[PDB]
Design a protein around this ligand. Sequence first.
Ligand SMILES: Nc1ncnc2c1ncn2[C@@H]1O[C@H](COP(=O)(O)OP(=O)(O)O)[C@@H](O)[C@H]1O
Ligand SMILES: Nc1ncnc2c1ncn2[C@@H]1O[C@H](COP(=O)(O)OP(=O)(O)O)[C@@H](O)[C@H]1O
Ligand SMILES: [Mg+2]
Ligand SMILES: [Mg+2]
Lengths: 272, 272
Amino acid sequence: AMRQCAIYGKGGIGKSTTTQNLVAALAEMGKKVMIVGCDPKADSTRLILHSKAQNTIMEMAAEAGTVEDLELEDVLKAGYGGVKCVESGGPEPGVGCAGRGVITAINFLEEEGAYEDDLDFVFYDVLGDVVCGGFAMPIRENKAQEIYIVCSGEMMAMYAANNISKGIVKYANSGSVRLGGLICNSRNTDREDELIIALANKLGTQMIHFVPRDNVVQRAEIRRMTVIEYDPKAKQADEYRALARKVVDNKLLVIPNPITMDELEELLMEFG
Amino acid sequence: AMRQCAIYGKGGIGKSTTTQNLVAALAEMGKKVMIVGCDPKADSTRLILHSKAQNTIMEMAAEAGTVEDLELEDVLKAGYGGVKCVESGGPEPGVGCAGRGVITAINFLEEEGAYEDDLDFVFYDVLGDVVCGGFAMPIRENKAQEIYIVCSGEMMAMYAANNISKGIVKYANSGSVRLGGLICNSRNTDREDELIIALANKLGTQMIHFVPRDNVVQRAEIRRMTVIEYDPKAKQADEYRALARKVVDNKLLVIPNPITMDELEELLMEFG
Ligand SMILES: Nc1ncnc2c1ncn2[C@@H]1O[C@H](COP(=O)(O)OP(=O)(O)O)[C@@H](O)[C@H]1O
Ligand SMILES: Nc1ncnc2c1ncn2[C@@H]1O[C@H](COP(=O)(O)OP(=O)(O)O)[C@@H](O)[C@H]1O
Ligand SMILES: [Mg+2]
Ligand SMILES: [Mg+2]
């Protein structure tokens, strides 16, 4: 068995920081993990690889001729804890569908047999400001069985969570894609944990963990590291370990119940 | 003559708040303005209309049969200061291209002759987390002659500004789409104005105004109003008046020079 998880959320909310730290904590426990970057920013693996970023499948296919000229052993790169990493890439702005590289990358990984039985987890890090094209592909095509949405008390972050939830509902009649939980990535605001717990309850899920705002994240990332590797004694490292444990143990996977704009505004008004 | 301006930027950065307040200030001066919402969130006109949001062209076309069954006088709605408002809408998440409604809306407005000589400004409020499909249409098809990018000292907001700038460069050989400036929408961080001035200088543009973070914005928006209407004496109202004056007087419209990721990181490291 292997569990296929996707991390969605609005831009800049903390998807890549949360995913790479969560995965580093999993590797620290002894799990074998692959990260698939599905955001055109293409910096979803840099903290595992200690790198500037990673060259993308779209780029490598173009340099090599066709995607068929690429071998898996040439594309996947291992970093901290043996975690295997790949970036989809995407077309330049104004040219074609920004999600087109996700389709190419996931199909390549499947065909080349990247999904060996000994992987325990695959994490997709997916842009979530729009749910369409290649960004909807992990849901539409049954690749991301367990979706976790990173969010905050920010209206826009909560709206994105509701929109991703609507996409999950749209494809509920096929496949097994389900909402596994919300991850609150704190803005240091009061009762923010209670706000995201309330939103999760309205959607029918749970808030799996509250990740505090902590400057150690920036200090680790300036050095191209996860907090798990940079300072394993840090309180924030233990926060990511707790998140990873709760993902491992999570048994609640639901078809969510999206809410109205009126319900979302009422939520902010009450906790604010 | 009429000036066609588009406001781009990452999600949640302040596009709709800035656009509606800027436009209210223009109307307060006596300019005739239309706002075209080009973000699927479809709340880009609510503060002018005092409304929950606005029913979208996509919705109205479906209820009426075809877009040809709609008349312009039925779709455009006027609010504060006579400002005319329309929302594109878009398909539900997971269904089709999130930008598809922008194409339908702009073509409808052009065909129905919404661009009367007596309009002084048209503002498009455009999602900018991806630059593709209908969201690239205002650039690709020469609709948004002057682009202003709302941003902040946030890495993701600055990255989005660079990506939008790359889209402008891609279409530089046709049409007249140009970058008019950056608008800094403050995060209450130190030297944030200097950071965005530096980014603008590297792109070849200017930072047209620094908009402070001010709680009066939330108090106005809870009441579905611009600050200009809610509290015309507020310091923040004068900030939006200054922004509007500087847009009116702006003569610098450039093909921007996008920067590397290394340059962008160096910018944050220096000012941080
Ligand atoms: N819990 C946290 N504490 C401090 N900084 C954080 C935290 N989470 C994210 N960040 C910072 O926020 C910024 C955006 O995070 P990132 O994971 O790149 O967002 P996304 O992948 O969703 O666009 C990064 O600079 C990151 O270091
Ligand atoms: N200068 C400001 N001061 C205080 N709050 C602001 C300011 N600019 C924006 N906001 C708030 O930020 C949130 C997002 O703004 P919005 O214009 O809706 O973003 P976008 O249209 O880019 O998604 C809104 O709640 C808005 O009231
Ligand atoms: Mg990311
Ligand atoms: Mg908006």
